[PDB]
Symmetry: D2
Subunit: 477 residues, 4 copies
């Protein structure tokens, strides 16, 4: 029977008494795998108030002790890696290999963030006043909130809660309505190790209800969210009411530039190895491929060939496939319309292009050629495993077309010339630029997007600092 | 005849052709000293588009060259210090000594920010990938905007434009509708030295018109503003539409804690020397004074006495006064209502308390005693030179009442015990904490408020970084 | 039978064929517990050449992989904590509780240093040259050497090898001639986990022979040593021949200042809890106690009383004692002469003072009063558990007498006044200053002494950086 | 009449009463241009004691005030640029254009170092102890000393005194025996502006006398010196006696690598524009040129041609020459022997090679071909304007031969391939690596050599920090 999940508030699971429920489905089979409460603002507040009551003592704990708690959580996750991976596979529809890697990476991530305990520092600044000391301490924000999407849901829990908890903050996470299972599992692990009550809270429900509360509540020092530009806009607008800080990651349209002097094998491999790191969906995966004439011909063929081998199907019954289904009906439909609409503007369907009609939501890896910068397929979050390929004459053109977007999170260039690389770097307006390799942010790097791609960022030292604020003390004599 | 100011766009003053005009008045005499255009969104866009066209080349300039331009501007300001001070005095109504100091400080500030040219740095992070380099470059945001208030208007130009220009950004400033004169003077200096066209733009008008455009325009990478929580809320909400970054400083209710073991002379002096650093108005000046029983009696008397000597009048005709008039009618009225409303709740008028009726907007330094944390005078931006004094029993009480506010920008404590100081520091939830001295942020410190007091910050290295974003490059082999 | 230890070179223990041997004795029983080769320069070179051959590949390993090796070593140490502690107790003569803590701390230390893998960074500096990038990479020094003393020998292995190995260096350690056993045990653990050959090398022998080679060999990029000023002088002088970098920690005469307004209980406790963290010997333990008249009387009595409870004896047969014997005959004799010589100058023996004559080398906790800054007991490395107590009138006096020394490693002050603390801090010329607590350097702090106390330092980020050098790259276009 | 210079000690020039004098000569004309005292240790001590008496108050000054003094000195230097340049030209024998640039750069340098006043910072580290603060303050070393060489003597005054003075140190400089005039001029400027007495001291004499005292005096916290490896060895060995810190820059044998895919014009230009930035003498100038077969032929011809245009002669009577004479007879002779000795081993004299016999010390730009890594001309400080050119087959060869040296200060590579550049960077063991440009260290970079090239470094933030030490405060509650 499809299990009914309770929320995790103030150190204890609480059974939802409400009358309405949200059904969680398997994108592959399309059946009901579980049910979560249709939580409301009042639920979020219970969690926020608990987070608030527990924040002073949690922060009073030496950073090293907080790191210790984080290590117990990562340890709990490893002991249950397969159980958690299967949940990710089941509700997210991502291939088994990917799920396992997500679970391992998330545990390695929490451990990497635990290591900041004795390393984040404040500063001692020289004053102009005789005998005066200016101390700059790094304090915690207080209560923080996390609103996660269905892509990489398990990891996104750690990316937000780990930094927050290490710095002395308390957090209230709202997993995605479509992928709440891994979150429940995470809360079970938090419960087992016994993390202090209120430090970590999990509230189930919809973004418009539980999400808006996680952003508009006056007690929240900062609301962190990952997803679509649209939701980021509603979250920032609501946070505005209380001058609440925000941490947004709205992905985008990752562009990739392939020069003639580029290792043909590497580029094709890297772009393919990227793109479908789920079903395609992932935003840091080359959604816009720019190729110059001199190599266009060869590049397209190898690429076209590489994409055919990519088979799709139920992730749980197939460990030999490279693509699971899409997260849901809405996602599948939008991919069709956008592809169809694209072909009407001149898009040349070189591969796939026709939505599969049957149990689950699948879309064959599609390849669009003769695409133009002007076309609407270039200025929208594609979703599906679609790859538009626009030809270009020179680096200046390529850089100009890549920078031509409302998104500026991830970019990549495949070349071999010292000036081209350095010129592309200095020219590309993105938070990230991969040179001759696949797009996958390192935990010690800094995931932050320019323009509409976001505000603030994640990972590494700067990601950690997003959860700290400063207290400048002017100690006169 | 009251002069009519043109706007400064794309390297040249432009005469406003519109039919409507905004009258600039002298808070002291109450007469019309000049007129500024009632600018509209389209005006702001002309400036933004110019700022956008000029940004690439400006950033392409070596940081040292940009610093050079900034030094010419500071040099221009010093050559015209008196002229600019008198403008500040005239329209802002602040005492002459204060105006001169503002002009000198602002010039020293621009020079201090110019020194960051060769000092702000990116980082080289160790990768887990064999032979891979992770470079983290600091790039400019692009086009930025500044929306200034009437308090410290001249300096606030530099606090926003200096950091922005040094890092490679272009800016569009909208001075306050009540204090645009000093801004025009600043633009004249920018024009004289010949700063590259578009790098610095000045647009006149109202916040609801020209301000909303400076915040909602998709071409703006970041909008910086200083003023009231209310305006910050409208600015952040509008910036939300384009996920535009924001830099807000909404002042607050600066609290001050006086312990018994506190140098009575110093505290009284510091609190008085602060408070009226204009007419009172300044937000970093002890608006909430907490005193403990053991010293309450003596502290109130010396304080009461110190406040009587504070005389008010026209800043231009009086260099022996300690207080000019309030910025305008609205400000004066609110101060009255709030004082009256306060006395009804139990507030004991120990000094002043009655609004002066005549040319200009003056309010005698007022002292409210027997005030309670509960009273509404404690939870609002007082404006006028009013000082509520609430008694308290112990440090825990004092800290708890100081932290009890929607604002968390500035705080201060007067004591002598090593544990008290360290306990107050660790306990106070403010961006700043002054110990045994008056509240005046150092240029190399970091002016940033907790809670509703703001987002991001200003001054020092961290202030400089608010104008930089990161570009993480993954150079694989 | 007293075991004969082989050296650990190029990933394998090697049996010493030489004819001479150095006898290792138990300071408590005075019997031969083991024997180590009387190594010569040629032995050190074999190790250095191995370290050199292995350095390129070791450094080529991603920092995270090197950290992984370090974690295996710490894990090995914990699995054998008791075995290693007993060795420390046996040859070093330190009380059991201390040995266990040393073994645990050293393992926690290696793990703390392993966490620097993805955190130490180079920088990207703004150039004045159009289109030029200045990259500042942090590279490894190459081959490094460590020369350890008998105090905290086990930990001192990790304090030198952990930072070196994490940054990509290879190392050659020479344990102390009197305490080589724990080192052999450490090498066995390195061997078991299989650390790459040459990365870690252990060479046994005397300082004048194997030590001089570890410092004068042209292949050594840096020689790190901990011990007496005299040895530091011979090591630096030899390193001079090849402009070899040096890292010295020569301890000193840690002074402690007790003010009248100081928690009498805390000070007496902290000074006693310190001093004898072995037999006394430790250099960071208040070897010079300054007390002011107003509290002198009481402080001396409680202190005198606290010292009587400190019993001495064989660490292995007594877990109820607070002091083991001294490292050897020479140390015991010097303590006597210095005490006797001190009493002749006016020193008042308030407790102990008479060397015990029998198996082992013991010296009763001794207390010298009426001591004067002038006396020679204040300007020499006391060694034994002796405590001179000099009276003083004011802070200026106390600070001046504390700063009056050739050593500037550790200091401490017990007071409660905000100005006194801040005044003592700004006045004391030491690398460390403890306020109201016992002297024990934190792993994330920075152990570095002023004047003759050393060069460079250890622990924390700065300790880590001593093993890194910079490579500034000027990439023009 | 050849003027006789007095020393500058404790804020006042002091006339040398000794009987012996050292004659200063003009390398071009060879006549006596002035005379300096043959100072002795006692003279150096007078300066050190003055530096010591003045250090506390100087450091007590807010950093900004010290920076102010530094700006007055730079201002003084500009007002007397020509006077100072002519002195440099006269005694150093460097071409006029170079002297002027040195004087301007040194003044810009002092100003750049003055900007560190409010920027160098200490840190606030997280402790594991409940309620404990770890403050890490940056304090001054105390008294420092500078021992300068004849190359870039004026600038080397600022490179050592500017960082030292800004951080709160006092200094005692000993200019080079052959180039003391510019130093006297600098002291006159220090005197005119009125720098506090003792902060800056100038002592004339020989290295073996006044230099040894500047290094062996127990009151010196650190001795900074620039010159030959030999002198560095004597200075470090002497400093060893008191565990005195040292800052050495012993230049070396700067190698340069020219790949086939390298802009022939640029490389030839850069190597020529470098080399003779005086008479040749400069150590950061390609003293070892590595060229690969594929381009060897062409590279040698253009280079040979470029070197012919380089004319030599008296710098004061010729503003159309590219090379002045050598510093003295000894330097000229060594250049001959080494060239002659080189030709005997197989060196092919492609240009120049014969020492000019007449007034002054000149050596025609010489070009040695068919040189082998083995030859002794590759393993010695050439001095003269000699250029050995060794052919090589691949990058690995080139990198291996460049790294094959006891010196590791400066390196350069001329290529265009992204992998070659990145491979050369990661492979070259030098403190600096220039890519496609001439060798000239930036003031905000970091001049520090690997191996025998030095200890510590200069310029930029890290150069500044060499003059600071740390004070870790453990404030428990
Ligand atoms: N009504 C519908 O049918 C719609 C469905 N979608 C789905 O969302 C996908 C988009 O990708 P995704 O990465 O999930 O990103 P989203 O932008 O949808 O954001 C997902 C996360 O943001 C929360 N959120 C959504 N709206 C708000 C809001 N107004 N205020 C606060 N939080 C909010 C979500 O809640 P929650 O999980 O409750 O959505 C979830 O936690 C689509 O592909 C589609 O599957 C998108 C729009 C409409
Ligand atoms: N006796 C002779 O004839 C010798 C002359 N030289 C000259 O020195 C040049 C080397 O270049 P340069 O850059 O000047 O570098 P050096 O290594 O000669 O060092 C020059 C600076 O170091 C000082 N110094 C030299 N020896 C010592 C010492 N033992 N202890 C402390 N300080 C010392 C010098 O003093 P000072 O200026 O007094 O030398 C000077 O301030 C040669 O080309 C040659 O012209 C070198 C060796 C011997």
């Amino acid at each position: 029977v499809p299990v009914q999940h309770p929320m995790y508030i103030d150190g204890q699971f609480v059974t939802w008494r409400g009358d309405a429920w949200i059904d969680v489905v398997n994108p592959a089979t399309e059946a009901v795998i579980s049910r979560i409460p249709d939580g409301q603002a009042e639920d979020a507040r219970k969690a926020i108030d608990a987070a608030e009551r527990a924040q002073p003592e949690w922060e009073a704990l030496p950073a090293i002790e907080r790191a210790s708690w984080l290590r117990k959580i990562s340890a709990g996750i490893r002991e249950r890696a397969s159980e958690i991976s299967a949940l990710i596979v089941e509700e997210g529809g991502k291939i088994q290999q990917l799920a396992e890697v997500e679970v391992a990476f998330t545990a390695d991530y929490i451990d990497y963030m635990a290591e900041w305990a004795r390393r984040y520092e404040g500063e001692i600044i020289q004053s102009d006043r005789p005998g005066e000391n200016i101390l700059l301490f790094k304090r915690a924000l207080g209560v923080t909130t996390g609103i996660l999407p269905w892509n990489f849901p398990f990891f996104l829990i750690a990316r937000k809660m780990a930094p927050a908890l290490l710095t002395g903050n308390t957090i209230v996470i709202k997993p995605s309505e479509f992928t709440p299972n891994n979150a429940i599992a995470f809360a079970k692990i938090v419960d087992e190790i016994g993390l202090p009550r209120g430090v970590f809270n999990l509230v189930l429900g919809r973004g418009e209800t539980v999400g808006q509360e996680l952003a508009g509540n006056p007690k929240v020092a900062m609301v962190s969210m990952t997803g679509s530009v649209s939701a980021g806009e509603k979250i920032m607008a609501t946070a505005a009411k209380n001058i609440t800080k925000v941490c947004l990651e709205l992905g985008g349209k990752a562009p990739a530039i392939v020069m003639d002097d580029a290792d043909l094998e590497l580029a094709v491999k890297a772009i393919v190895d990227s793109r479908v790191i789920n079903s395609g969906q992932v935003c840091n995966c080359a959604e816009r491929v720019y190729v110059q004439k001199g190599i266009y011909d060869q590049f397209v063929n190898r690429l076209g060939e590489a994409m055919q081998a990519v088979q799709f199907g139920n992730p749980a019954e197939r460990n030999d496939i490279a693509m699971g289904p899409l997260i849901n009906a809405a996602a599948l439909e939008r991919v069709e319309q956008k592809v169809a609409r694209a072909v009407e503007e001149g898009a040349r369907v070189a591969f796939g292009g026709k939505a599969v009609e049957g149990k689950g939501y699948y879309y064959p890896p599609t390849l669009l050629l003769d695409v133009r910068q002007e076309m609407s397929i270039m200025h929208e979050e594609t979703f599906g495993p679609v790859l538009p390929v626009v030809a270009f004459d020179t680096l200046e053109d390529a850089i100009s077309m890549a920078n031509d977007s409302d998104y500026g999170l991830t970019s990549s260039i495949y070349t071999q010339n010292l000036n081209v690389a350095m010129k592309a770097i200095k020219g590309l307006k993105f938070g990230e630029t991969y040179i001759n390799r696949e797009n996958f942010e390192a935990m010690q790097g800094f995931h932050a997007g320019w323009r509409k791609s976001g505000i603030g960022g994640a990972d590494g030292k700067h990601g950690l600092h997003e959860y700290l604020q400063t207290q400048v003390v002017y100690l006169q004599s």
